[PDB]
Amino acid sequence: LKEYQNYYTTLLEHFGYSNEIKSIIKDVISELAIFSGDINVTFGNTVSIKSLIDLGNKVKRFRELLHYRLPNDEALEFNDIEAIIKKNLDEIMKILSETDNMLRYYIDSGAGINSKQFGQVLSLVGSKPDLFGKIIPYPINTSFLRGLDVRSFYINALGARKALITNYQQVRNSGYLTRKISMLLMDTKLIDLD
Amino acid sequence: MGKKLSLIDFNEIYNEENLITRANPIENHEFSDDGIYSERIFGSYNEDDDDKDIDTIGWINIEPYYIINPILFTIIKKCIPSINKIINYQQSIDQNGENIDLTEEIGEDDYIGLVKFKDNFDDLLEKYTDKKKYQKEYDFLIENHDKIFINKLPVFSHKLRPATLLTGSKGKVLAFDEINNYYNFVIEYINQINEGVVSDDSIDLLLLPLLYNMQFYANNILTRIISEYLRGKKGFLRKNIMGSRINFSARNVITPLIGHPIDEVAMPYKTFAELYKFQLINLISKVKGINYNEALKFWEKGILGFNQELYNYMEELITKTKGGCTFLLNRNPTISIGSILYLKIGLIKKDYKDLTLGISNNLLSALSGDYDGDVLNIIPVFDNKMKEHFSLLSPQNFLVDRNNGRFNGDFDLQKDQILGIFILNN
Amino acid sequence: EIFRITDANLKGDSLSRSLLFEQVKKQLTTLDYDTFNKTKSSILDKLL
Amino acid sequence: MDDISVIKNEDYEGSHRFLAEELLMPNANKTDGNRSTMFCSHLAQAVTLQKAEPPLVYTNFENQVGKYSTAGYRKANSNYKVIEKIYKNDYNYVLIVQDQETGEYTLFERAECEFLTEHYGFQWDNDKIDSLKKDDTIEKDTVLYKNTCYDENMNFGYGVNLNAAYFSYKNETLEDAIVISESAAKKLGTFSVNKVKVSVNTNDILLNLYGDNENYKGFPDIGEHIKNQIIASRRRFDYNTALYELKNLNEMRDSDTPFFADGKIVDIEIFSNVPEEELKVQKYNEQVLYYINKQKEFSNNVYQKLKKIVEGKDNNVSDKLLHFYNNCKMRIDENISYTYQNSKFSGFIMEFTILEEEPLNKGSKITGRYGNKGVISKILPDDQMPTVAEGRFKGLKADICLNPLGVFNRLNPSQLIEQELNWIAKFIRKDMEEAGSNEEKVSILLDFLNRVNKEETELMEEFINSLNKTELEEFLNDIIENGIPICQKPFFGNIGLDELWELYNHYDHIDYFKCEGISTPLIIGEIYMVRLKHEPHSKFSARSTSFMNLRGLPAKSKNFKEHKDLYSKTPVRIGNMEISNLSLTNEMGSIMDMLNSYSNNETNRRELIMQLLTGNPFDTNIDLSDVESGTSKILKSLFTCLGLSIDDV
Amino acid sequence: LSAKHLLETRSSKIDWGTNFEENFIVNRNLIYPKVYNGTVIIKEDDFKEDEETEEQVFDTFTLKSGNRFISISSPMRLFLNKDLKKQLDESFYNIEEMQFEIPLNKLDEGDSFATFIMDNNELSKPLREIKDLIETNKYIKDHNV
Amino acid sequence: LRNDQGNSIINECSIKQEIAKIKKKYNVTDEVMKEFINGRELNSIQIYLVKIYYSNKFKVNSNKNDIFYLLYGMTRELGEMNFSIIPEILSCAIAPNVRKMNNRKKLVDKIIHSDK
Amino acid sequence: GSSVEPINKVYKFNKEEKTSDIERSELQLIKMSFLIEKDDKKEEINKFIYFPKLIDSQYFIINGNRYYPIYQLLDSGTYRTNKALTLKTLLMPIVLREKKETFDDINGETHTMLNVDLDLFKSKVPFLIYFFSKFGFEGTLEYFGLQDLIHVLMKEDLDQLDEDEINDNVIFMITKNISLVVDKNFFSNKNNQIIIATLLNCFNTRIKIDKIYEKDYWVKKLGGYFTTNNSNKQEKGEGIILSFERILDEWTKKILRTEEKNKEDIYSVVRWMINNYLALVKQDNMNLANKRIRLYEYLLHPLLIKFSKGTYRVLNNRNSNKFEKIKTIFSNIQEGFLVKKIINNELLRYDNSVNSISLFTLILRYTQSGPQSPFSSNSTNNKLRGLHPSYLGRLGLTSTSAGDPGASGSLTPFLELPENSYMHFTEEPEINLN
C-alpha cells in the first residue's frame, strides 16, 4: 500500500502539474474510498477476547509468553530489563503474523495495532517515570490483562497525573512560539530573474 | 508607501471653539454641560440624532505657565538625573522668617522651581550630560527644542470611557472608568491657579509646589492610557486592529458523511436559513410579488417550525447561483497548514432537529481534528470577484505537497480505509 | 551580526511589525530600539 | 523517589479503603490510569434518564451510595400523623402534619418539577404521598416521593442495558462514532425544565395570541401546551399615536418583543404592584385578574385553617412552618409593595415553569462505564441492523455498533471481559430455559455461579431455600425472561485470566453466532450505557446583524439568557494567527476589503447590505466604496492624545 | 505532545569500572558486596552537599580491602546507607586520622549499602535545544553562518 | 446599547421601492412636482394622515422629497376613489394654528349614533 | 461576648407601607456586645449581623439561589519553604529566614555558621535582640537556659584567662577588649551553635560594659533600626514591642500540637522553634500527617479583615481624643456585610450540577485554592499538584478536575477523622521530635 503514493507522484509530474490533472486525481480519491466501505460491511472486522484464548491451545509457545513473570533470583540493571521486554515483544509479532488467526489482517496492514502499545496488554509493562523524570525503582511485574497490585496501582496513578499536567500546561502556552516567527518572516517575495 | 512616526505640535491643531472648564461632572441630578462627560462637545450616549464622530477631541487651556511634555519626560530623566528633586520647592524657615540655607548637602543647582527651570534650560543641560554614554539622546533634544514645553493638554471623547448615571432607591450611583479620575484632577488644579487678579507678588510656597504636583499627575495619565488600552492583550491594539469580531458567521459541530465528493458538505437547516438571510428575501419578493416589509414576516414564520414553501425556494438558490454557495471553514486554534479551507455546499438536511455539519472522512485528517466534539467557525463569502482570489485555498490546490513536491500524504487513505483496501487488494 | 528572534524584529527597520509585536511602552517612551528611524515598507502596513 | 517503600501490600488485603468514585466501575485493576481518570468526570456529567434500570453486572456498592445520597428522596425522620392537607393549584398542594413523640408540627409540599440548574432538572415520581390522605399514619422507613432514578425497592440505577457488538458499518464508525437502532433511541430519553420571567409595565399590553375576543387569553392555561414556541409577546404602546397601531391585535407587528420557550407549562405565579381597583376595569388584563384572585384565595384559606395552631398557646411549630405561615399571611394584608433587585417595579411580573421531554437526536454523546466515549452519528431503522438467522435463538439483533479499531490501542481490556461475561450468561440462560424442571433448574444456575464469584453462592443458596414453591417458580421465570445478574467487585475479588480460560474450557458446546450477509463469526453481548450532558444545541450559534457595541464594533448581547431569542447570537472573533493564515495567499487587498466591509466601515457595511438586498440574487457583482474606516479614526485619536502621529511617505 | 505522551522511556548503559564489577554486583537501586570482611576508607573532604536532598554524596572513594586498595570512580552519585549512617556520627567518625573508617563486618549480610538515583534520557530533550538555539544566545552569538 | 440595522435598512428599501413604483405607475415627471408642491413646507396634519393611510405597508421616514411623492400618491389614490373632501384638504396648505372648539356634542351625537 | 438571638415571631397586622422581597432567602441574627470605657464615658455598643443558616444540612439558599459549602485543605503550620521556615497565623505570617556567615576566633580558625532573622514588619532583624530588649541580657541568658555556659570578660580578665581552659573552653572575640567565655562541649551541637552565631552577630564594635545590663541601650538600637529620627528612637521602639506581644492569638494556641510548656506566649513559641531548627528544616512538606481541613474559618475572613483595618487606624493616631476614633471603629456595621462580602468575592461556589448522584460529587469535595492558599496557577508550583504515598488510604488518587489538575479531589468515604483533634488527619506530626 505504500507504493500507492509513488504512483500518484508519478502521475502529476508526467502530465506537467496541469490544473486539469488535479481535478481528475481528486475524483479518484472519492471513488476509491466509497467502494472500500462496501468491503468492510460484507466481510466484517471484529475484535474478540476469545480469539486470543483459542490461539493459546494450538500454539504452545504463546502459552509461555502469556504467563511470564520476571525472574527475581538474578541481579538485573535497568538496561537488562529493557532488553528482556524487547526480546519477548519481538517474538510475539513473529508468531502472530506468521500463523492464521483473527488478528492476522490487523497486524499485516499495520493500521490499528501499535507495536509498543499492544505489548503492554499481553506482556509485562516494565518501568515508569515520575513527576520529575526520575525512574521509579519498582518495576511492574504483572501485565495489564493478568491483573494489578496495590503497590503497582500507585505507580500507574503517577503516570496518568503527569499527562494531565503536561497537557494543560501546553494548552496555556501553545501559540506563543508561532506568533514570534510568523510576524518577522513574512515580507519575503519571489522575483522571476534567472 | 512607507509609514513613519514622528512628534507633533499641539498649538497648531488647537480649536478655540470647544474647551472644558468645570469641576463637578454632575449638576442638578444630570450630566453637566461643561464637564468631562459634557454632551455639547463629545455628543450624546444613546442618541443617534447628534451624529458626532469619535475623532472629536477636547482641549484644556493652561497659561501662562508651561509643563514638560509627558512623552519626552522619560527621555529627559535619562539625559540628566535627579529630575524628581530639581523641580520641587523645599524652602526652610527660622523662627522669625529669615530663610535658612541648607544647600551644603544639596548640589549647586537644586530646588529652583519649574518656572525658573524652563528659562535656564539651555545652560542647565551642559552640566550633567555624559557625552560618552548618552550621545544619541543629546543630539535628539537639540533638533526638537520647540516641543519641550507644552501649553494645552488634550482629552478624547467619552465614547471610549463610558459612565452611567443609573439610579437606585438607596441613592444615585455613578460608575465610570478609572482614567476619568485623573482627567478631573488637572482641571481642578489649573482652575485653582488663576484666581489671582490684582497685580501681586504671589508667595512662592503657595504656587510653586502646586505646579510640581500637577506635572506628576500629567505624567501618570500617559502611563495609564498606554498600560490599559494598547499594551495589554485585551487592549485595542491587539483586539480591534490586527484581529476583529465579524458579522455573517456561525459555529457548528462535526458529523461524518459518506457517499459524496470530497469537497461537498451539508449544513443544518437553521444555520443556512439565517446566514444567507438577505439573499432569501430578494428571491421571495419577486416570486411572491410583495414588498420587503410583508416578506420579512413570512420569513419569521418559516424559521420557527419546519415548512415546505420556504424549502422550495431554498433548494433553487444553491443550484442556479454562479459557483455555488461557499464558505471558509477553520478550526480554533490554527497552527497547521490547511487548518482553514474553502468548501462548497451541495446538500441541505431535511430534519429540523438536526444541528450538525456533515463533512467527508478524508477531509477530516487535514484539520488534524476528530469527532470528540470540537466547535468550528463558518464564514460565508459573497463577492464573485473575491471568490477567484480565494480559490487558491481550496482543497484541490492543497493536493500537491508544498514541502517536497510529491503527493500529499494527508489527503490519502487513513484509519479503517487503509484496512478495507488491504483485504480486497491481497 | 546575528540576533535573537525577539530582538531581531525590534531592532529591524520596519514600523508596522514593531508596534504589533510586544513591548509597547519601551518602543514609544525611550529610544533604545530607535523607533523613530524605521521607514521600511511592509505588506502588513495596510492594517495601520 | 524512594518514598514508595513505606507502602506495603500486606495490610491492604481484602478491603477497598483506597478507592474514591471508582467503587461503581468494576474490574478497576485492568484499565490504565489515563482512561480511568476520565470516568470520574463522566460520572460528574450524567443527565437523568426516564427509563432508568439497575445494571446487570453490579459491583454491590451502588446501593449504599444511593441510600446515603439524600438529594433525590425524602423520608420521614419520625412517626407522623396527618393533620390537614390543602390545595393551591391543579397539581401542587401542601399538607400540615404533626408528630406523635414530641408534639411539634411540620409541613410537606407536593410538587411536579425541580430546578437543578438553569436548564436541566427532573420530575418527581410522587406516588406514595398522593395515596396518603385523611389522617393516616406515617412510619419511620416510609419514603414520600422519589426521583425517577430510584426504583420501587430503593435499588439504584443510572443507565440502561443495551445489546451491543463490535462491528464496522460503512466506515461510519471512524474515530469515535456510534450507530444506534430506532428501538434503542426510543428506549433512551431525557428531561428538561426551565423557568422564564416575563415582565409587563403600565404602558405595555399583551396580544391575543390564544383564543378569540370573548376570552382574551394572553398566556396559556394551567395545563395546556404552548404552540409555535412563543409563550407571550408584548407590544409597546404610546399615548401620542395609537389609532393606527391597535387596529388588529391578532397578528404580530414590526416592533414586537416576543418570548420564546418550548414544552408544557406546569406552574405559574404572579406578583403585582398596582391597586386592584384600577386593575378591575382593564379588559385586556383579564386572565391575570383571574389567576391573582385564585392565588389570594389560597392564602386566605391558610389564614382560616391553622390560625388556631400557631396563634394558640401551644406554638410548638418548626421554623419552616412558621416562616411559611408568615410569608402567606403577608399577602392578604394591605399596603404592601414588593421589590425586585433592590428596586420597585411598576407593572406586575409573573413566573413560568415549563417542562419538556427531549428525545435522543443526532450529535449527542453516550459512554459506557470504562470511559469508551462515543458520539451518535446516524440512527437506522431496526431492520437494517445485523441479525442472527442460523442458530437456535434466531431473532436477536444488536442495538449499537462500536468502533473495533481503537480497542487495543486505547489500553482498556475491561469491555471485552464484560461482553464475554454477558455472552456466557446468555448461553447459560438459554440452556437452562430449553428444558428442566424446577427441582434441578437452580442447580444448572448454581454451577455457573460457582466459577465466577464464590461469595455469591452462599447467598444464592440461602435466598433460594428461603422462599416457597410459587415464589421460587416466579423468580425462575423472571430470571429466564430478563437474565442472570453477575456480581464481581472492582479491585479485590473478580475474574482475571485463568478463571476465564477454565470457564471457556469447561463449556465445549459454544460457538460464535453466524450472522446473515457477514461471513464472519460475531458475538453480541449486553453493555451498560449512560447519557452525557454535552449537546449540540447548547453551543450552536449564528449571527446576521445583532446589536452593536457603543464604539461601533459588533459585540455580545444578553438576550438568550432571558429567553428573548432562539440562537445565542454571538459573533466569532478572528484570532491572531487567523489573519496571518489568510495572508498565506499572496492576495491582501481582498482580505482588507472583506474585513472593512464586514466589521470595520459603517458606510461600506450599509452599501454592501443594500447592494446585496436589491439587484440580482443569482449573480452578485458588488462594488465597494472608499471611505476612512472607524478603526483608523480611533487609532488616530488615541495617538494624537499620546502626542504622536503616523505620517505617510 | 504526542511523543511526550509515550511515558515509557529508554535507559543508558553505565560503565562502573573493573574494580566496581569485581566487588559489587549492582541490582536496580541497590549495591551489595561480595565479601563483608573488606572495609572502606573515606576521607573527610570526599563528602559533598547534595543539590536536592542536601544529604552527603561521596562520588569517589577508595575501598579499604585490607592491605590491598583500588580507587573507585563512580559515574553516578551515591547515597550512604541510612542504617550505617546512624553509627557513623560517633563510632565510625574518625577525625583523628582525617579519614573515616567504615567496617563492613559491622553491616549484616544481605543489607543495603548505597542507593543511587538515575535520570532517564528524555526523548523531548533534542527538541527543546532547537528552541533554545533561537532565543538563549548560548551558541548563536559566537559563530558564523 | 444601540438598536439594530437590518430592520431600518429593510424599511428604507421598502420606501424606495414604493416611491419607485409610484413614479412608474403614473409616469409622473419632475415638472408635475414643481407645479404641485408650490414650495410649501410640511405641516403636522398632512404628515399624520399620510402616516395613517400608508401604515400597513410601511412607515413614513423623515425625508421631505419622499414624503411629498407619497403625498402626490395620496391625492391621486384618494381622488380616484369616491372620496372628495380629503384630496381637496390635502391639496393645498393648512392654517398656521389649529382652531379650538367646544364638545360639539350634537355633531358628536350624530357621529356616535351613526352605524360607522 | 456574643450570642444568637431568637427570631420566631407571629406578625401582627400593621399599616406602615412594608417592603418585601420577591426572592426567598434564609438568614440568622447574631448579636455582639462591647463595652467602651473611658474616663467618664462608658458606652455599650450592641451590633447585629446576618449569617446564612444551614438548611437540609447541605446548602445555603440566598436570593433564590443555592450554594454548596466546600472543605478547604491547608497545612497545620511550622512548615518549610525555599530557604525559610514559616508558621501560618490568622493575619500575620511570622517567618524565620536563615543566612550563612563566617567568623574567626582568636587563633584565626575560620568557621561558617548560620544566622536567623525574623522577617516581620518588612525588615530583617536578629531574633535575639527582641529577647534582649524584653528580658535583658541576663534575663535572656537565664530564659534560654544557657547562662551557665555564656560569660563575658573584660581586657584585664582576658589577660588573666585560664590557659589550661583554652582548649576546654573556646574563647571567642566580642570587641577589641571584651571576650566571650563558652564551652566547647556546648559548641559541639550545631543547634546550640546557632545561638552563639546570632549572639556574635547582634553585637557591634562600639560597646560599653555598663551598657550591656541596660535594656534601653539596645532598645534605642531597635528604634533606630525602625525609626531613623533620633527624637522618637525610644518611643517608636516601645510600640513595636507591644505589637510583637499580640502577633499570636488564641486560635493558633489551640491548634498547635506542642505541649503546654512551649505554648505560654510568643517568646516561648520562638524559643521552642529555634531550639529544634535543624529537625524542623529537615522535614518534608508534601506529607499529609501535618495538614487539616477548614470549613468556617475561611468563611469568616471579611470580618477579620475589616476589624484589622479599623484597629490599625486607631493604633496610628496622634495628638487627638481617642474616644471619637474608637466610636468610629464600631460605627459602621451593616446588617448585610458578611453576605455581600462572601457573595461578591466568590468565596462560596455556585451550585452547578445536573445529576442526582451527590455523594461523590459535592458532599465530599476539597479544594486547595482560596484565601491564604499557596496554590496559584501563574506561580507554576508543580510540586503541589503531585502525589505523595501518604495520600493513599485517606484521599482519592483518581478524581481530578480536568480544567486544573490537582486543585480539586475527593475524600475517601471510609476516612475516619480522629475525634477531638479539630479536623486533623493524624494525632502526631510527621517528625516525632522525641
mmCIF file of C-alpha atoms in Angstrom, chain D residues 1 3-4 6-7 12 16-24 37 40 43-48 61 65 68-72 114-117 120 147 150 156 158 271 303 310 319-320 322-323 326 329-330 332-340 533, chain G residues 7-26 53 55-56 58 66 68 340 350-361 365 387-390 392-400 402 410-414:
data_model
loop_
_atom_site.group_PDB
_atom_site.id
_atom_site.type_symbol
_atom_site.label_atom_id
_atom_site.label_comp_id
_atom_site.label_asym_id
_atom_site.label_seq_id
_atom_site.Cartn_x
_atom_site.Cartn_y
_atom_site.Cartn_z
ATOM 1 C CA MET D 1 11.979 8.976 44.874
ATOM 2 C CA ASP D 3 9.278 7.025 49.449
ATOM 3 C CA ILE D 4 7.271 4.185 47.860
ATOM 4 C CA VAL D 6 6.604 2.653 53.058
ATOM 5 C CA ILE D 7 3.646 1.258 51.085
ATOM 6 C CA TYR D 12 -4.220 -3.661 52.144
ATOM 7 C CA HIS D 16 -11.494 -1.366 49.315
ATOM 8 C CA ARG D 17 -10.495 1.502 51.599
ATOM 9 C CA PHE D 18 -8.334 3.266 48.979
ATOM 10 C CA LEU D 19 -10.894 3.954 46.234
ATOM 11 C CA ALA D 20 -12.974 7.111 45.781
ATOM 12 C CA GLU D 21 -15.524 7.372 42.927
ATOM 13 C CA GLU D 22 -14.118 4.124 41.461
ATOM 14 C CA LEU D 23 -16.389 1.894 43.559
ATOM 15 C CA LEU D 24 -19.022 1.994 40.809
ATOM 16 C CA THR D 37 -9.485 9.188 35.423
ATOM 17 C CA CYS D 40 -14.847 10.496 37.306
ATOM 18 C CA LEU D 43 -19.974 10.375 36.187
ATOM 19 C CA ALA D 44 -19.886 14.044 37.201
ATOM 20 C CA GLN D 45 -21.655 14.920 33.918
ATOM 21 C CA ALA D 46 -24.529 12.452 33.510
ATOM 22 C CA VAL D 47 -28.102 13.651 32.944
ATOM 23 C CA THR D 48 -31.166 11.779 34.199
ATOM 24 C CA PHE D 61 -21.598 -0.880 46.185
ATOM 25 C CA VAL D 65 -24.249 5.158 47.677
ATOM 26 C CA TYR D 68 -26.570 7.978 51.561
ATOM 27 C CA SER D 69 -27.360 10.464 48.756
ATOM 28 C CA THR D 70 -30.253 12.470 50.210
ATOM 29 C CA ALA D 71 -30.658 14.922 47.310
ATOM 30 C CA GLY D 72 -33.232 12.816 45.455
ATOM 31 C CA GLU D 114 -37.253 20.684 40.342
ATOM 32 C CA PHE D 115 -34.779 23.269 39.047
ATOM 33 C CA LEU D 116 -31.362 21.665 39.465
ATOM 34 C CA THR D 117 -29.718 24.370 37.340
ATOM 35 C CA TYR D 120 -31.611 20.610 33.466
ATOM 36 C CA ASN D 147 -36.756 10.757 41.717
ATOM 37 C CA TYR D 150 -34.705 5.089 42.220
ATOM 38 C CA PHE D 156 -30.233 2.492 42.462
ATOM 39 C CA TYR D 158 -28.239 5.453 36.410
ATOM 40 C CA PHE D 271 -46.740 39.285 41.709
ATOM 41 C CA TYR D 303 -55.177 32.111 57.484
ATOM 42 C CA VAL D 310 -49.638 28.893 65.719
ATOM 43 C CA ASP D 319 -39.013 27.038 61.744
ATOM 44 C CA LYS D 320 -40.166 26.108 58.234
ATOM 45 C CA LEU D 322 -43.632 29.446 60.945
ATOM 46 C CA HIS D 323 -41.732 31.051 58.067
ATOM 47 C CA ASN D 326 -45.713 34.450 57.995
ATOM 48 C CA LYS D 329 -50.074 35.942 55.861
ATOM 49 C CA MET D 330 -48.026 38.796 54.383
ATOM 50 C CA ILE D 332 -53.645 39.134 52.480
ATOM 51 C CA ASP D 333 -52.740 42.334 54.327
ATOM 52 C CA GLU D 334 -52.969 45.866 52.916
ATOM 53 C CA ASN D 335 -50.490 48.478 51.674
ATOM 54 C CA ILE D 336 -47.753 46.025 50.668
ATOM 55 C CA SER D 337 -45.379 46.696 47.768
ATOM 56 C CA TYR D 338 -42.819 44.179 46.544
ATOM 57 C CA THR D 339 -39.327 44.928 45.252
ATOM 58 C CA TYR D 340 -37.082 43.220 42.702
ATOM 59 C CA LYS D 533 -24.638 16.376 29.319
ATOM 60 C CA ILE G 7 -36.169 35.014 65.524
ATOM 61 C CA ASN G 8 -39.548 33.288 65.954
ATOM 62 C CA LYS G 9 -42.426 35.775 65.900
ATOM 63 C CA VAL G 10 -46.071 35.969 64.833
ATOM 64 C CA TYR G 11 -46.745 39.013 62.668
ATOM 65 C CA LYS G 12 -49.463 41.424 63.796
ATOM 66 C CA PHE G 13 -51.481 43.483 61.325
ATOM 67 C CA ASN G 14 -49.866 46.853 60.626
ATOM 68 C CA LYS G 15 -50.214 49.823 58.265
ATOM 69 C CA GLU G 16 -46.679 51.110 57.700
ATOM 70 C CA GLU G 17 -46.028 50.538 53.955
ATOM 71 C CA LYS G 18 -43.904 47.443 54.468
ATOM 72 C CA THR G 19 -41.379 46.336 51.846
ATOM 73 C CA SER G 20 -40.986 42.663 50.935
ATOM 74 C CA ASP G 21 -38.533 40.953 48.602
ATOM 75 C CA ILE G 22 -39.596 38.882 45.609
ATOM 76 C CA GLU G 23 -36.948 36.183 46.076
ATOM 77 C CA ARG G 24 -36.540 33.912 49.087
ATOM 78 C CA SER G 25 -33.528 33.809 51.401
ATOM 79 C CA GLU G 26 -32.797 32.400 54.858
ATOM 80 C CA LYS G 53 -28.248 29.165 58.064
ATOM 81 C CA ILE G 55 -30.854 24.130 55.589
ATOM 82 C CA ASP G 56 -31.164 20.421 54.722
ATOM 83 C CA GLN G 58 -26.114 20.614 52.890
ATOM 84 C CA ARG G 66 -28.464 27.505 46.099
ATOM 85 C CA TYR G 68 -22.793 24.461 48.445
ATOM 86 C CA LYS G 340 -22.381 40.799 50.452
ATOM 87 C CA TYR G 350 -22.182 28.232 42.794
ATOM 88 C CA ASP G 351 -24.191 25.008 42.655
ATOM 89 C CA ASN G 352 -23.955 23.847 39.022
ATOM 90 C CA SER G 353 -24.767 20.131 38.881
ATOM 91 C CA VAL G 354 -27.068 18.057 36.697
ATOM 92 C CA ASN G 355 -27.039 14.547 38.222
ATOM 93 C CA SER G 356 -28.736 13.303 41.378
ATOM 94 C CA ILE G 357 -25.587 11.442 42.488
ATOM 95 C CA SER G 358 -24.351 13.984 45.033
ATOM 96 C CA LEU G 359 -22.293 11.886 47.471
ATOM 97 C CA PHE G 360 -19.116 11.682 45.367
ATOM 98 C CA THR G 361 -19.678 14.960 43.520
ATOM 99 C CA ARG G 365 -15.036 17.721 47.754
ATOM 100 C CA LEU G 387 1.053 12.985 44.743
ATOM 101 C CA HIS G 388 2.591 11.529 47.892
ATOM 102 C CA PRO G 389 2.494 7.980 49.298
ATOM 103 C CA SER G 390 0.609 9.368 52.307
ATOM 104 C CA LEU G 392 -3.269 6.583 49.613
ATOM 105 C CA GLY G 393 -5.665 5.404 52.309
ATOM 106 C CA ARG G 394 -7.091 8.833 53.163
ATOM 107 C CA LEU G 395 -7.694 10.599 49.819
ATOM 108 C CA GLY G 396 -8.736 9.925 46.242
ATOM 109 C CA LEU G 397 -5.886 9.426 43.787
ATOM 110 C CA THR G 398 -8.157 9.379 40.713
ATOM 111 C CA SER G 399 -10.812 12.117 40.746
ATOM 112 C CA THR G 400 -9.229 15.324 39.441
ATOM 113 C CA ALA G 402 -9.843 18.365 34.071
ATOM 114 C CA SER G 410 -12.491 13.909 46.684
ATOM 115 C CA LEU G 411 -12.229 12.498 50.194
ATOM 116 C CA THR G 412 -12.317 8.745 50.687
ATOM 117 C CA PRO G 413 -15.731 7.731 52.098
ATOM 118 C CA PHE G 414 -14.078 5.267 54.511
#
